[PDB]
From a paper:
Ethylamine (EA), the precursor of theanine biosynthesis, is synthesized from alanine decarboxylation by [name] (AlaDC) in tea plants. In this study, we solved the X-ray crystal structures of AlaDC from [name] (CsAlaDC) and SerDC from Arabidopsis thaliana (AtSerDC). CsAlaDC and AtSerDC are Group II PLP-dependent amino acid decarboxylases, which exhibit numerous structural features common to other amino acid decarboxylases. The overall structure of CsAlaDC or AtSerDC is homodimeric with two subunits exhibiting an asymmetrical arrangement.
However, the corresponding loop in CsAlaDC is disordered. Among these mutants, only AtSerDCY111I exhibited a marginal level of [name] activity. These findings indicate the essential role of Phe106 in the selective binding of alanine for CsAlaDC. This analysis revealed that the amino acids at the dimer interface at positions 66, 97, 110, 114, 116, 117, 122, 315, and 345 are different in CsAlaDC and SerDCs. The results demonstrated that CsAlaDCL110F and CsAlaDCP114A exhibited significantly enhanced enzyme activity compared to the wild-type CsAlaDC, with a 2.1-fold and 1.59-fold increase, respectively. Our findings indicate that, following the excision of the zinc finger structure, CsAlaDC became insoluble, while AtSerDC displayed a similar trait to a certain extent.
Author numbering:
A (entry chain A), B (entry chain A): 62 to 69, 79 to 481
């Protein structure tokens, strides 16, 4: 709970670090709950930990602080711009400290385009989104959600129509935290158009912390492209790509950044970021990864993760455990384990009667089998004899996906 | 300007990293302008770059994500609480991604204590402060500054008195960016009291990005202590202590955090941070440093830096170069070099007619001599023959510190 700092040792401290490394190997082995790629292969870059790298200021305007990684950073941003179909001279962006910063930036951009804008996001938006709205003092209208976690564009439509006067700022979830739903970009855009909102009276941010990275590697789904009238897209680098430290990529339209960007004389750069000092090792790490693997290495990794999710779901239903997997998802929602020591061991994320597993590149079939074997074994003790019987997840995941004493019958 | 990412190499990429390491050694050698300690000695911790460490959530409430460094983080926060004289059960805080996040958090805390609060900060506050005020939609009253960069408590008094009705939220600069001034905490507090503001109608944040760390190691100055009615203090970890990546420490009063802190079920933790995912290598790095050096190692390092600043200033005045150093400062303000290739080589920060050198632990007498020898040599070419004569820095640093053709006479 605390490692106290005492006054002057190198055997004590190397003792601690040996012990600690041990626990991190254990934790890394059993981690299944959170969307972090734990297969980190950046051993050559670790030398660079000798430098105080700081990308302080604009990625595209070099500051007087010379210990930076802008060549890498700009490399990576260009790749992301290509990925989301925006040209060099149409886009601006930066490597962030994570999905939260991408969301704070994107929503702030939208506010500056439309200071009077009403803000809309689904009920299953990440907590960062509602935090942003409160930080920024924006009126937030929570939009309903279908069973699977997608924004409800009928409820969206309704809500739009009762604020016809004002501009709409929208956050769309490309892979919701709990259920792994993907908001229908195309349908949201259509709904705006047929409610009388033209491009120049709405701003959309796409929160793609995990799945915004993954979706472009599939042939399907509501493609993320600035050929459509979206404003900004963020992803998290420590989620799908994998990074020792949290990071992200935020990409917007250049015309949008002018309202945030101010000159700062003592930097000889501009400030258009949430942050000041910025992590300059992240850009190198992500550059390294993009180069080694390319679009075809990432595609493979994405496809294997969807397959491994499919597999886990199948085995759970087979075991008569309520479980759901959305079409565009590596997140397997399932009946929350009753044993909370079990939850803590596999580091499961839980909400109400749901838990979930996120099938990151590190998450192998071998590991899923270990997991299932343990789950099925312990589960036998939870709902048998005169005890309750499994919870009903039909309200959360649909009755088609529920295997309680009632809904299992209908399959 | 860009290192393009191409599709599949390990000789090309290790070629790039050899080249790049070279430039970072060069940059590290000549860096003088920014407040980053470049003497990083954390080579043993670099193994830990193999792990996706994430302190996601509250430092004091463990989340279900197990790959974290809370033992280290909490260790470090406790040390900082001791340092600023606040008890375990009176304080909350976290390790941030830098001084900007500390400021965003602190100012946001103050807003939640006083939603109607008028916000006050000096004209020489960091850009993060004015950014925060705009992000948060807070009315910001810029307070004047004495020549040396300290907040002007007469102008403060005046400004307070014309907003007697509303609470006061104040940012105080403990080491302003450009001039290295320290706002007079004690005098600000007195001014509030004699203007009719009792403790429970003002909130103070101390921005101590560089000097909040350094000041406690001196026997003098407006001591930073929660025994006085301050609300929150931030420092930057990559400034004085030194860290490969930007980080910081934000420490507030526990009673203050309740308004920001919300439970997040899927984490099994609380969200009271600006961020979500948080860097978990930083806490280890700062823990390592605090343990190896202790209060007595840091004191020594602080004292040497003040001495080396004193030295640089003296040699500049000797060379008839306008220069100033505040009493509680390692930042040497001086006539801005006319040669902007020279500015770029020593990575100097510049504002108007001022440049500055920040004497971080890495900045040795040997290095300062190299610098001065070059400066004096080139300067001989700038203001001689029929050309202008040096600029006057008296408006910026005081006529006592100016060595232009006019003010040098009066000394
Ligand atoms: Zn199937
Ligand atoms: Zn059911
Ligand atoms: Zn002297
Ligand atoms: Zn003068």
């Amino acid at each position: 709970t605390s490692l106290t700092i005492t006054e002057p040792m190198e055997a004590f401290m190397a003792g601690v670090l040996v012990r600690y490394r041990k626990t991190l190997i254990e934790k890394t082995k059993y981690h299944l709950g959170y969307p972090f790629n734990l297969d980190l292969d950046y051993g050559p870059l670790a030398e660079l930990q000798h430098f105080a790298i700081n990308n302080l200021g604009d990625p595209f305007i070099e500051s007087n602080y010379g210990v930076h990684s802008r060549q890498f950073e700009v490399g990576v941003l260009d790749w992301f711009a290509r990925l989301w179909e925006i040209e060099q001279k149409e886009y601006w962006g930066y490597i962030t400290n994570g999905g939260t910063e991408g969301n704070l930036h994107g929503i702030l951009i939208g506010r500056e385009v439309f200071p009077d804008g009403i803000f809309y996001t689904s009920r299953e938006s990440h907590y960062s989104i509602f935090k942003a709205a409160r930080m920024y003092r924006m009126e937030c209208v929570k939009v309903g959600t279908l069973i699977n976690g997608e924004i409800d564009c009928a409820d969206f439509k309704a809500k739009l129509l009762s604020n016809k006067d004002k501009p709409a700022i929208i956050n769309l979830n490309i892979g919701t935290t709990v259920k792994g739903a993907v908001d229908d970009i195309d349908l949201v855009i259509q709904t705006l158009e047929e409610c009388g909102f033209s491009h120049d009276r709405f701003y959309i941010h796409c929160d793609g912390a995990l799945f915004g990275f993954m979706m472009p590697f599939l042939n399907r789904g509501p493609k993320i492209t600035f050929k459509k009238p979206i404003g900004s897209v963020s992803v998290s680098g420590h989620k799908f790509m994998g990074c020792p430290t949290p990071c992200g990529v935020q990409i917007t339209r250049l015309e949008h950044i002018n309202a945030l960007s101010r000159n700062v004389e003592y930097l000889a750069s501009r400030d258009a970021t949430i942050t000041g000092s910025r992590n300059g090792h992240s850009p190198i790490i992500l550059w390294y990864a993009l180069n080694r693997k390319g679009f075809k290495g990432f595609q493979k990794e994405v496809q294997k993760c969807l397959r491994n999710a499919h597999y886990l779901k199948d085995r759970l239903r087979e075991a008569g455990i309520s479980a759901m997997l959305n079409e565009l998802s590596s997140t397997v929602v399932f009946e929350r384990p009753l044993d909370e020591e079990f939850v803590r061991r596999w580091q499961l994320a839980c909400e109400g009667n749901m838990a979930h597993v996120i099938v990151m590149p590190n998450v192998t079939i071998e590991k899923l089998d270990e997991f299932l074997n343990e789950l099925v074994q312990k589960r036998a003790n939870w709902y048998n004899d005169g005890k309750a019987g499994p919870p009903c997840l039909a309200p959360d995941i649909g009755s088609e996906n529920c295997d309680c004493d009632l809904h299992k019958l209908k399959h």
